[PDB]
Amino acid sequence: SALVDQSVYAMVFTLLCSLGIVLCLVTSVTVEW
Numbered sequence: 001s002a003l004v005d006q007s008v009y010a011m012v013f014t015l016l017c018s019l020g021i022v023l024c025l026v027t028s029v030t031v032e033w
Contacts (some may be wrong), residue, residue, distance in 0.1 A: 015016065 006012075
C-alpha cells in the first residue's frame, strides 16, 4: 500500500510487534518453568 485502507498503518504494526514481544516472553518463561 505504499503506492496505494487505513492511514496510520503503524498502529496495528506496533500492536502486532507488542504481541510478538509479549508472546516471546510468555513462550520462553513457560518452557523454562
